[PDB]
Every structure is written in structure tokens, then in C-alpha cells.
Amino acid sequence: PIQQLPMMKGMGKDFKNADYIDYLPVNMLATPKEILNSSGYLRSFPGITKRYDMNGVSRGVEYNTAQNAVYRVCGGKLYKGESEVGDVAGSGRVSMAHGRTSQAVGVNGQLVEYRYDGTVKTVSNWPADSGFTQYELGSVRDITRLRGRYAWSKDGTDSWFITDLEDESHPDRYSAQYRAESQPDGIIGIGTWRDFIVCFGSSTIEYFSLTGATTAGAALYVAQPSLMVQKGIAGTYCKTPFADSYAFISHPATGAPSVYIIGSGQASPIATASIEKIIRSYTAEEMATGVMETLRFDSHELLIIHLPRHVLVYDASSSQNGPQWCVLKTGLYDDVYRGVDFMYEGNQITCGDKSEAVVGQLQFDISSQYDKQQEHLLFTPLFKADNARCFDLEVESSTGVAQYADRLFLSATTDGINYGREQMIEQNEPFVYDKRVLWKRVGRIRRLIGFKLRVITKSPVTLSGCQIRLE
Amino acid sequence: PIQQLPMMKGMGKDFKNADYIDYLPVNMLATPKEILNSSGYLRSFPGITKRYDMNGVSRGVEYNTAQNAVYRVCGGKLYKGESEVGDVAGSGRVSMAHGRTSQAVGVNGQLVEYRYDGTVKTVSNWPADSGFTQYELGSVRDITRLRGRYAWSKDGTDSWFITDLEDESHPDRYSAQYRAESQPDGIIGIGTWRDFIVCFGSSTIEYFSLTGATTAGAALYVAQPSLMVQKGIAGTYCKTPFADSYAFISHPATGAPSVYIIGSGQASPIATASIEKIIRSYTAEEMATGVMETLRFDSHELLIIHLPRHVLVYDASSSQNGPQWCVLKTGLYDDVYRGVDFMYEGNQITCGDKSEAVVGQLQFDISSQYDKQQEHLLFTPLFKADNARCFDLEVESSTGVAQYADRLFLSATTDGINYGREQMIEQNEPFVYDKRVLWKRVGRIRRLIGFKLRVITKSPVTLSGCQIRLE
Amino acid sequence: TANVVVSNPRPIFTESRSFKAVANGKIYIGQIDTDPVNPANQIPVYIENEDGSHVQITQPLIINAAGKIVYNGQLVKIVTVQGHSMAIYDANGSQVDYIANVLKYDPDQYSIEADKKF
Amino acid sequence: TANVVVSNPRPIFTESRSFKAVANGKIYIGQIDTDPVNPANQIPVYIENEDGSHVQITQPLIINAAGKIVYNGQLVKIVTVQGHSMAIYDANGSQVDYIANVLKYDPDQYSIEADKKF
Amino acid sequence: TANVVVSNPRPIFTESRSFKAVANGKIYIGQIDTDPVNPANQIPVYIENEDGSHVQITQPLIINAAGKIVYNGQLVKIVTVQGHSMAIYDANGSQVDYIANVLKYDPDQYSIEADKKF
Amino acid sequence: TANVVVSNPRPIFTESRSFKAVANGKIYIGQIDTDPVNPANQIPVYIENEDGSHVQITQPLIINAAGKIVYNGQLVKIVTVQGHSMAIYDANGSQVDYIANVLKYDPDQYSIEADKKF
Amino acid sequence: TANVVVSNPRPIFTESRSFKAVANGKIYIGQIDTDPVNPANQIPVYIENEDGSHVQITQPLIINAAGKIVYNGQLVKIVTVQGHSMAIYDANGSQVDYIANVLKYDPDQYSIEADKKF
């Protein structure tokens, strides 16, 4: 009897606490598509090839819909495409926004606006010679743009400000300050969903709409209590517009964190128990430094979360059996993934780097990151097959696009933690499109069994239809 | 054992990156209809026969509901039906609108209005001798008509203007300028959905409705933020009213482009992974030059997209198993389809030409384009049939309407990319209505198999009920 | 210097699966990627004589028992004006082979080409 | 001008000591004046399909019982660059033929110098 | 990504009326439009090696059981300087084929003509 | 510097009276100069995996028919601290070997004092 | 959580050309870069016990059927003070192995050297 073994999600035990955990695929994305007896396959994440050389590691990215170009902060420089257009001080992640007249960067507690004419301004109070209101402009944490105004949050004081309509280098003349105010504190992040200013605190997410007032001093924004979410975000960059709302990671102020997508006044969990355990392995710090982003290609709608030790990708287009998660990494020994700050421009997806002063372009006919061969994992769930004596381990692989006859390390575990002997079986061949990857004689199953299916390639890996004969 | 083989959608592998892709039917449309043991058939796209002779290639088309006639721009001429009614400058695609007393063409940054009395006007500011407002009328990108006014978008400056009620050759005396303003930039296209001015930018689509105000200087249009769509369009002609809303191709500003239909504040994807890959094969340019149109005949609701190398047709009425797509082409070597600017008038569908100065009328009892034989393809999905030794490859064909005993090239692939020998089988015969297209002895299947089913005809092709005997 | 290489001018047409000639077979050549048996798809075929007469003949070419093209019982050389598609049929009438696109240039009469080219 | 000659597609490869095809024989195509058996000297070879796509294939080409190149038991059209060397080996591993430069077997060798001179 | 089909460059000579090689036959190479069997009409013939060296050999070219030219029991490529005529006779002495002008021009004399007229 | 020696992984344990592996033998690892059979003196032993994780395993290590440490019939890599004592018993309970300190079996015992001195 | 693989520290001596132990063989320990079979070239050899005491023994070290050094029918660890050369002969007197410098230096003299210079 032939039995099909799923490979899109594995299963095992954690030897630290003897609990059951999922084994996520590494450098693999699941694509639901009926190929043959399969109804889905697994394809390696696209590799990275060098595009440009920059001043340092990437610190921010945005698509400038005004200039129709991608602006990247790298090291101490700000680039419009390939050419440097400004100097940015600091060393960490920066906020990025833009409008008609300038590209704004939130860095070092400042909202530095690089105008397209070549001048650089900074948001500051109106001069006292003006008859205009002066505000307590402290530090800047996060910035955003809406309706021709920059809205930014003051660091740790629950307040946010907007810029003037005819002068974006100053706050509003009469009514610039607003507060979330349905909370003791928390203004961690700021964004714009559809036409609202969204203030992401801890334990609250608040929405603000334009009032349409005309009288001087009247409030230009009003909170919408019907749209507010009773949950917060862990860090200033722990949120992204994913599908039509914001996906975020919750603050410890409301319990153990996980991954949520905002619905209508509520948040729906996206993370599984294994993802929650991975998140819980981090302190409150190392969790506020996580960076979230989104990717879109070939009907793939990926949500990428970078942590100091993990890069976790959630696929919303392949989550028909529950949330679909995978791990991105660089190297062969669980080193963190180096790609960050993805952005689609022209007809290519371009990324920054976490460790080198370079930029990539995410080539699709390879799987190596900057010419370095990468590792891919595909586990199968444990199953009870006492005295089964399995045979004919078959997998379907799409061969032909390869530079070497790269192989497959096939091993089996019988306790859920430790894997045994690895056999090397050729899984690809250059210019050969009919290969039949297969291992005839698998051993006898005593109580339990599970397979690892490790590959190391510079070429794309496409695997589907894992099957065994159990006799 | 008799097994039925679907032909409405094929399946194979791309030899460039070893990925799985769909093989769309070429010059064939799928009609869901219970014929016999089939529940649907595949019919060749109607051929094109010459109707008129124009000045040049077609640049625009519209049905003038005021005149009850079709207006076409061909070369340097504008025709109402068959007779020239104006001269139009330029060489590329033009925008079309019409109203009570004129047919407006948006071309060369101008809104040129050809009035039915024979005089031609152009939109310009009111003379300074008037006490009326003057506006920064720059270039014209796209035009439309609503409620007796022309609404057009200024090129690259996010603004749009309306004309005056009692003088359509000028903007409004008091309040003509409006801005989308919920965006840093983008006014790529303009249209009218039901009673709204729809402004299709990049990364947003905004809706404007009439306020009903009567005071001078008050805004006559107000934006509806509740109907907004958080997605853009690729080019000025990458949108069309498809079913009851707009179907469009998205901008790179929101990720990798695909095909969407606007719902209620959201966009629903229509393209599949293969269509997204085809779109991604084009740069940002060659994607803004794409054109989108709609056809309707025999319950077929076709959405046609013209690209420099592909013409892709989506069938809304045959999408019960997922989106249904096909390819239109001219010749035998994947040359782009020459038909463009379809419009139903009288009882005939009429098209322009992309390479010659002619017009067609889309005859239904042929399949040739301007008396030249055309090629039709029908692929089957790959399947695993190890040691099958198949027999009796049958297909049901509706014969009788033919000028020659046209034949079928039947081949098989065992790897998904390369096809073997082609066998010639007569699939049609003039004045014969019982044919039994069939091949007796197909070979043994080692691992995988799939068929191509190529036809070259000047007559309609109707194929259904593909079946094999697997023994 | 070596200007000529001794070679065989007569093409040989054999079976697809076995080392046997297509005895008393037929050849139809026409527009590329088409069915050459349809006379509308057929293209002119000429016999190139020993001096260059280039006399046109009817399309179906007859294959000898040796696998060579014959006309009036004599070995002939057949030439065409363009790349074509080929269809070789057996004496029984079965499709021996179909080729969608073939183009082999005539390696002879280079003096005329040089005169027309230089 | 009838500059295209009706020749035999699907070239036939014959044993060098008898009138027999090289069944299950191997063919290596590489750079000119080198050994194409060593994969460092090999050059791409492409299957040409009906739709016009060129698909690079594994270098050792397999010869069937009729003496013609096959891919999976199916007759295919194989294309490479004009300048290449060829090595044909029998199924038992013995050299059937070697040619260091195919372009030197054209009947007219004066054409190359004439084109490269005037 | 290629612009020539992989063919078989080495010539093979078979019988004109039956599908079999001209085993142990003879090839006579001579002046254009003459009878090359006559030694007066014969012209020098050389074998060209893999390197490119030329070795003049006696005129009667030996065909082997495979239908190929062999000099010292090994396949050889035959070259000439001037345009020639080629007559192939079988082992029994019956004429198999005759070509009075293989290229329909003389590259040797046309080289002199073109060196001055081009 | 070639300071790494290509040696044999999967160490082999042999019977002390005959050239035979200790099949189904038991190994205890403990503190230096102690009885590792007593669980009070035992020290952790870890399986080192492909992924790099170290998993502590039950102390009695099982020796297969090849003389190697196995976990579930599978060859594994077992690691511990540098200073340990080892006891090897046969499947019948008889003592095969005892080593009070493995570090004292290194060929060079001057290295330890030299490192601790200068 | 470890930094050394569990190995087998007790030496075993096997034949250099066949997979068998040197049963009842001889080991001769002597001066560096000399022939240690000669008693004049030999150096004192001691057995080191579990406690750490040393017992000087006669030079020819006995290799039992298991391939291990045994003095009083029991496994012993052999130590020396100075660097040595080692020669292993089998039971029939044929030399099995020879190493002229087991550590490629003399720790005895290098001890004084390092005390002087480090």
C-alpha cells in the first residue's frame, strides 16, 4: 500500500521540555497547485545576486509613489535607486515616509526631510516671532504621511503631531497635538490604514479620522472608538500593512505575544503554538527589535518577520490547512537570514543586507545567496507504523536547471529528536528533465518514524509528492 | 479503463527555472455546457474578415450613445462608422469620451472635442476678460464624461478638472480643480463607475461624487473614503469596466503586479500564478503600454489584455474551477494577436488592427484572420501513469463546416517540456458530420505523459471529450 | 590549397526506427510548421540539372528503393526557394516522419553567389 | 533563387567498418580541435521544438537503431554552433568516429576564405 | 540558441538502386566534365589529417564495407585543389554514380578570376 | 598549518582477549579516577546531530557488531568533557576495559605541563 | 555541551596489509631515528598503572591475540621519558611497521630547551 507523506509541515519533540513542536521547512515555500497526485508542491526561496554596492547595511526602505522610485537608507547614505541623494546619521533602523515635496526619514528623534530640490530641513516649532502655537516637540519615534501631512509620534508620551499644510517643516499653526488617550500610555508606532491615522500603543490600537473643521484651533482629527483594537505592538517596527489591514506582534502588556492581523475592532491570531514558543524564547528586548515586512510574487503573499535569531515567513495564500510558516536562513548552521528590506521595483524584487554594504535583486533561477550555496529542509510528521517495514521512498522533483548534480541527504528519526544515517541521493542534474529521485529499501519501523530530506544547492529546488510503500 | 483528460487548462514545466506552469489554450475558449459525458467544450476564437479600409492602425474606439454609432481613431483620422469625421494628430493610443454635442478625444496632452456640427474645439482656460477663475491647465492624461461634464486628469500632478455645464470647451468658472489627495502622488487614469468620478492612481483608487452644492466657488465633487481601494493601476489604459466595476492591472508600487476586479473598497485577484509570471516578464515599461478591453458574446464575458508579446483573455463565465485564461495570437510562431479595439455595433463585433490600416468584423463560421489560416493549441495536464500502456486516444469534434479536410498534430511529452513525434489525424471534413477523430495505439507511459493537440485551420475548431484507455 | 572535399551529393531517406530506406515513399514539402500534404501549403520544387536548368516538378517526390529521390527513373537533385516543413510517407501510406522546419543551403554554385554578392 | 536543397533531416550515423547504424551509440559535441568526451571541452546542444523554443539537453546524444539522434526514444532536432568537434562512440565504448572541425567537411572550402577576403 | 543542425559530416557512398553500401568500390576523381576513370583526366588527391596536413595518394579511392573512404584501413578525408568530376563504381566494376561538376564551378580558376575582379 | 589529522571517526571498541568487536557491549563514562558504573559518578554524554544540537543521552552506550557506539541501531557521534573515566563491559557482564583518565593516554604528555607552565 | 568525542584511548596494533591484529607480536622502543631492535639503541620502558605508579619492564613489548600490549597477561599502558622510535614486528619476525619519531620531537631535551628559553 502506497502512503503519501506531507512535507509542507513537519513534526517532532523538543528535547529541552519533551513537548511536541512543528518542524517548519527551511528555505522552502509551499505552493498549492495540483501537479500530479500531489495538490501542491514546495519550491526553494529565490536566491540573491549582487546588484549594487552601498555605504553600509540597510536601515530602511520605501517606494516613493511621488518620484516613482525606491528610496533606501544604507549606512550613512540615502539613495534614490542607485544614486546617493542624502546623508543620514545614526546606526539603526529608521522610519521612512514621503510626500509631494520631500522624502522624510525618522531618525535620532528627528523628522529629517530631504527635499527633491536638494535641500534638507528638520521639523521644528514655528519661530516665536510668529503668532502661532508652540508645542512640546520632544523626540520622534515613528512617522507616517496622510493627506499631505506628516504625522509623527512623540517618544514615550502618548502624543502625536501633524505638520502644517503649506509648510511641512513645522507643526500645524493652531491644532497639531493629539493623544490616543484611551490608555495610560503607549504610542509605540504610527501608520495609515485607509484614511485614518493609526496609533499602535501597548494594549491599544487607535484610529483617527479627519474632522473637516475650518475654525482655527479646532481639532483636525477625531478618534474612532468603534474601530479600536484592544491589543498593542511589541516594537515600533513590529507592524506592517499585510493584506488590507495591519499585521503585528503583540506586546507583553496583554500576555504572551503572538502574530495578529487586524480585522474590524478585533485581531485574529496568525501564529501557531510553535511560532508563539519561538517568540517567547526572546526577551522583551530582542523582540522590540524585530522587523516585519511583506512580499508578493507568483500569488505568494508572504509576511516576513526578522528576529535576532529567526526569520519567519508566513504564507497567507497557502494556509488552507492552518497557518503556513517557514524559516529563512543563510548558511548551513542556522545562521540568520541576511536578506532584509524587500521592495518590488521595475520588474524585480530588490533587498538590502544585514551584514554587508550590498544590495541584491532576488534571482529566480538560482537558490544561492551572493553565490553561496544554501541549505533546504523538508521534514515529514511523525506517524505510528509499528512493524511496518516500509519501502520505495519516492519524491517528485523538477530537474534540469542546475549547475551540478547536487544531492539529497535522506535520514530518518525514530524518537522525534535525533536523526540517524544520512544517504546521499541525486535530486537534480544539469539539462536532465526526467530523473526519478528515489530510495528503494528504507528500514523497518519499530514504533515511530519521520524523515528530514536535507538539500544543499546553488540551484532551485522543487519537491512534491513524497510517498512510501508500507507493504 | 477509460479516463477523461481535461483540455481547458494544460500543465508543464518552464525549462528556464524548472518551475511548474500552466499551459493555456491558444485561440480556444472554454464553454461550460453538458454535451455528452463532457460538461463543457472548447471552441476556436472567431476569425476576422475585412470590413473597411482606414488611414492607419487603430488608436481608440468608443460607442457614442448620443449618436448611436461607433467612433474609431485610425491613423490620423477619426471615423463615425465608415466615414471620416475628423483629423487626429499623434501616433499612439488616445482617450475617448462623448456627450450631448461632441466626441472628445484625449491626445497629445489636449482634450480635442469634435462637435457634430463639424467644428472642432479644444479645452483651454477662460479668457482673462472674463471674471472667471484661471487654473494651471497643463497636459491631459485621461478623459471621461459624467453628468454633462468632461473630467480629465492633469499629467503627473495628481489633479483633475471638470468642464463647465453650458460651455464644455472651458473648465468650470468657479470650482473646476480637484485632487485625490489621499496619496503622495498618482493620477494615472480616470473613469466613471456608476455616478462617481474614479481616479486610478498608483497605490490607491479614489471615488468622487457630486455634492449638490449651489453656491459659487463651492466644491461640486467630494471624495468617498469608504469606497477607496488601496491599490493602483499600471498604466492609463490598464483598466476597463468588466462586469459591474473596474478590472485593472496593479502598479509595481504595491508589489508584483497582477489582475484585479474592484469589489467594495477592496480588489479581488483574477490572475493565476502563470499569468502573474507572464506579467512579471515585462518591465515597468511595456506594462504601462498594455491595453484592456471587454467582449461579450454567446454568454462569453471576455476580459482581453494586450501586451507587446502576449494577448491574454480571461473568461468570467467559465471560471468555476478557478480563473480561466487563454492566449490569442496571429500566425504559427507566437506572434501577438493583431485584433484590438473590439466593439459591438448593429449585430456584429468590429475590431481594429495593430499592424495594418484595416477593420474587421469577427466572422463566426471561420477561424482565419483576413483569409490566413490560424493555429490552435489544446494541452492536457501532466499525470503519473507508470507502466500504463494507454490506447484509444479519442476526442469529440464538431465537423461539417470546413473548406479542407484539415488535420490535427497529436504529440506527447514525457518530461513536461519537450514533445515527441507528431501524428496527423483528420479532425474535420467538409459536409461530414460524423468523423470520430481518434488515434488507436499510443505508446507505453514510463513515468509521465501529456498531449499537445495542435490544429491549423481556416475553419472553426470545436473539441471536447478527450479520453484514453489505460488497460 | 584544399578547395574541394570529396563528398556524397545524394541524400538518403531511411526509416525512423530501423536502418531501412523508405522504399517507394513520398515526400511533401511546404510552408514551415504546417501540413505539407495540403496543396495550398505546398511550395515549388525544382530539379537542379548538371548545368543548372532548374526545371519545376510536381510536389510529391518519389523515393527510390535505395532511399534516393528519382524522377523518370533517374536520380535527381531537388531544390527549394525557402526553408520548409517536410512530411515523409511510406509506400503503404503511413507517416514515416514529419519535420516542422528544415533549411539546408545548397553548397554548390558559389561563383554565382559571389558574383551577385561582391 | 533555389538556394535551399531538399536534403535528408534527422542525420544518420553509421558504423565505420560495416553498413550498420550505431545503435545505442553516444555522441559528444565540443570545441573545435579538442576531445569532446572531457566535459570541460563540451559545448551546449539544444533540442529545437515545434513551438520554436530551444532547450539545452545533456551532452551525450543517444543514437537509435536507425542511426538517428533520439531524446527519450523520440526523434529530435539537435542544434549547436557551426564550429564544433564531434566524437561518436559505440555502445560498447569503442570510438566509431572523430572529427576535429565539422566546418572543414563542407564540399566547398573556398567560400570561407572568399567571404573572409572580399 | 544555435544556428546549425548536428549532421554527419563524413561522406557515405551507397548504391543508387538498392539500399546497400558500395562495399569495396572505387571512386575516380578527375577534371570537370570529363571521364575521371582515364588516368589522363585524373587529378591529384590528398588526404587531410586531423592537424591539417596533406598527404597525396593514388587516385583510386578505396571504399570499405561501411561505404566510406579508407586509405590505410582508416577513415580519411579526401581533398583536391581544383574543381573535379567524381565517378563511383562498385566492386563488380559497374558504374554506380557520376557527377561531372561537384560544385558546378572550379574554385582553383575562379580564385584567380576573383582575385583580380573583386 | 595542517594541524588536523585525517583520522577515523566512529571509534572502534575491541575485545581485550581476541580480535573481535564488543558486540552489545556497554560503556560508562564518568569522572576521572572513579567507577563509572555507579550512576553517582556518571557524567553527561551527548549525541551531536547534523543540525548541531547536543542531546544528552542515557549513560550506558551500546556497542554494535562493528565495535561502534549506536543509539537505536544507528551510528552516532558521542561527546563529553575531556576529563573522564571509561568502563567497557561485554554483553555477558564481564569487564572488558577500564581507563581512569582518558587524557593520560595522549601520546604527548609534555603538552599539558608545558601549557600549564608557560 | 561538550568539546571532545568519546574515543578508544587504548592502542591496538594490526597488520599493515591485512585486517588482522599482530597476534603475539613484538614492539621495540628505542632511540629517535635509529633501529630499536638493537639493544644498544633501546631506551627504558615503564608501565603506568591506574594509580599512576611506574614499573620498568623489559624492552620487547608483547602484543596478544587482541592486538594490545600485555605484560603479566593484563593490559598495560607503556610510557617513556624521552622521545623514541617504534618498530612493530609480527609473530613470524617480519617487520610490520616502523616510526622513526612518534612525536617528531624529543620532549626530554625540549623540556630543558623550553625551561631555558620560555
UniProtKB/Swiss-Prot annotation, chains A, B:
**Disulfide feature:** none
Q: Which UniProt keywords apply?
A: Late protein, Virion
Query: The organism sits in which domain of life?
Result: Viruses
Can the keyword Nucleotidyltransferase be found in this entry's annotation?
no
Compartments in which it is found: Virion
**What is the purpose of this protein?**
Acts as a tail hub by assembling onto the head-to-tail adapter protein gp4, generating a channel that is sealed by the tail needle protein gp26. Together with gp4 and gp26, gp10 is required for stabilization of the condensed DNA within the capsid; perhaps by plugging the hole through which the DNA enters.
Query: What is the protein's quaternary organization?
Result: Monomer (in solution). Hexamer; assembles as a hexamer onto the dodecamer formed by the head-to-tail adapter gp4. Interacts with the head-to-tail adapter protein gp4; each gp10 monomer contacts 2 head-to-tail adapter protein gp4. Interacts with the tail needle protein gp26. Interacts with the tail spike protein gp9; binds six tail spike trimers.
Q: What is this protein called?
A: Tail hub protein gp10
Query: In the record, what lineage is assigned to the organism producing the protein?
Result: Viruses, Duplodnaviria, Heunggongvirae, Uroviricota, Caudoviricetes
UniProtKB/Swiss-Prot annotation, chains C, D, E, F, G:
Q: Which residues cross the membrane?
A: none
Where located?
Answer: Virion
Q: Please list the disulfide bridges.
A: none
Q: Which domain of life is it from?
A: Viruses
Domain description: The interdigitation of the polypeptide chains at the C-termini is important to protrimer formation in the folding pathway and to thermostability of the mature protein.
Q: How does it assemble?
A: Homotrimer. Interacts with the host O-antigen lipopolysaccharides; this interaction induces cleavage of host O-antigen. Interacts with tail hub protein gp10; this interaction anchors 6 fibers onto the tail hub hexamer.
Give the function comment from the record. Structural component of the short non-contractile tail. The tail comprises six spikes that mediate primary attachment to the host cell lipopolysaccharides (LPS) and display endorhamnosidase enzymatic activity, hydrolyzing the alpha-1,3-O-glycosidic linkage between rhamnose and galactose of the O-antigen polysaccharide. Digestion of the LPS brings the capsid near the cell outer membrane.
Q: Which family would the database say this protein is a member of?
A: Belongs to the P22likevirus tail fiber protein family.
Name under which the protein is recorded: Tail spike protein
The organism named in the record is: Salmonella phage P22 (Bacteriophage P22)
